[PDB]
């Protein structure tokens, strides 16, 4: 957020005129004689024209080359920023942390390290919001607690951040880590568990207690604690499972930064996401 | 009750086994917590933020297909509460004649929090 506000204004801008812009281009078509009744068309055609327009993708990249005096350091400074952001994208894809701002995700200038305030999971009261089915893949009476994310992304890979990793870096450092990653921790023969089903349930405590019922105290509660375990396990051995047939390893990681980065899904989000930055 | 009963406990023994690590580690935190309190302008400037962000998400989640749009009394009411959970003296009277005039109408409520907000980010940096 503050590479963003340095941005806009060393030009003539301010980042609020990016929220005053939609909200007239999509107040503007609300009118009478409809020329667009359809959000999702209007919603991509004004990304395209704040990509174009305000915010340029290459903000980040430029940035970064201009603050270090060598290229030598801003090549490690990358090479690094792409393996941190992979391990800041896998630590928001599992356990299902919220949305990640530009305001939220911090980077260091001498070592290219990215980590994140806020890491608050996602959870959604409903049981009826899953692709997957209620009652046979997982059996719960109660309904409350699902650890489910909202966004339509997968993950935060916007044009900048992009544009800074590269096509090179973006293949063989980003998709890479975020498999072997997650090779490593299905590997060690139940170590998820063991740690996944004691914070889960702190999670469910607090979730219990947040909305005052915390009468539901019983191995009830222990069923909803091993359901989102076998949950976000599933998730996450999603990820490293290689095909027994001959198969691209990092394919779903693969299709998951190519649904993550189309601008039919970055339209389609708020605008405090700043899915242009 | 066993919670407190037990946290009394566990501080006894840190206490009388090291006593003087307990003593020095407590004047520490106290002290920490006495003399790093935020000044006024800095509260100021932290309540406008979230004032901000409040207003530009509520604003975005279609309240109506804005054609002049008013403020809820719910968002009205929680202001006029931080108004008096603000600084007394020099604040208040300056804070008032912003929701008082019918400034609340979700275009020059925004436009008050944001010039209030540049004035404000100025005045910190001019520190």
Redesign the interface.
């Known amino acids: 957020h503050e590479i963003h506000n340095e941005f806009c204004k060393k030009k003539g801008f301010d980042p609020d005129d990016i929220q005053d812009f939609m909200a007239d281009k999509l107040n503007a078509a609300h009118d009478d004689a409809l020329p667009a009744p359809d959000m999702t068309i209007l919603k991509v055609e004004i990304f395209n024209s704040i990509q174009t327009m305000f915010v340029p993708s290459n903000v980040l990249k430029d940035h970064f080359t201009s603050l270090f005096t060598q290229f030598e350091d801003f090549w490690l400074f990358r090479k690094q920023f792409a393996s941190q952001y992979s391990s800041f994208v896998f630590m928001s894809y599992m356990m299902m942390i919220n949305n990640r701002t530009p305001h939220k995700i911090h980077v260091d200038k001498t070592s290219g390290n990215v980590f994140t305030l806020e890491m608050l999971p996602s959870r959604f009261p409903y049981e009826r919001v899953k692709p997957l089915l209620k009652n046979h893949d997982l059996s719960l009476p109660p309904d409350s607690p699902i650890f489910h994310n909202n966004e339509p992304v997968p993950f935060r890979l916007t044009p900048n951040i992009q544009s800074l990793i590269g096509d090179s870096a973006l293949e063989g450092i980003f998709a890479v880590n975020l498999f072997t990653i997650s090779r490593a921790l299905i590997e060690p023969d139940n170590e998820l568990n063991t740690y996944l089903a004691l914070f889960i349930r702190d999670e469910i405590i607090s979730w219990f207690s947040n909305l005052h019922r915390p009468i539901i105290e019983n191995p009830q509660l222990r069923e909803m604690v091993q359901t989102n375990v076998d949950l976000i396990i599933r998730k996450v051995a999603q990820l490293g499972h290689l095909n027994s047939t001959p198969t691209v390893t990092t394919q779903f990681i693969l299709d998951c930064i190519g649904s993550a980065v189309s601008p039919r899904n970055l339209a389609r989000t708020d605008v405090n996401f700043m899915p242009w930055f | 009750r066993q919670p407190w009963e037990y946290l009394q406990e566990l501080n006894n023994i840190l206490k009388t086994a090291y006593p003087l690590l307990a003593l020095s580690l407590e004047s520490l935190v106290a002290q920490i917590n006495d003399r790093f309190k935020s000044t006024t302008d800095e509260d100021l400037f932290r309540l406008i933020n979230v004032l901000l ?1 409040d207003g ?2 509520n ?2 989640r279609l309240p109506f ?2 054609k002049n749009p008013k403020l809820p009394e719910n968002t009205e009411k929680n202001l006029v509460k931080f108004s008096t959970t603000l600084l007394a003296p020099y604040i208040r009277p300056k804070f008032n004649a912003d929701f008082i005039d019918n400034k609340p109408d979700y275009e020059t409520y925004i436009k008050r929090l ?1 010039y209030w907000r540049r004035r404000l980010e100025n005045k910190l940096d001019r520190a």
């Open positions: 962000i530009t998400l604003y975005n297909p804005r944001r």
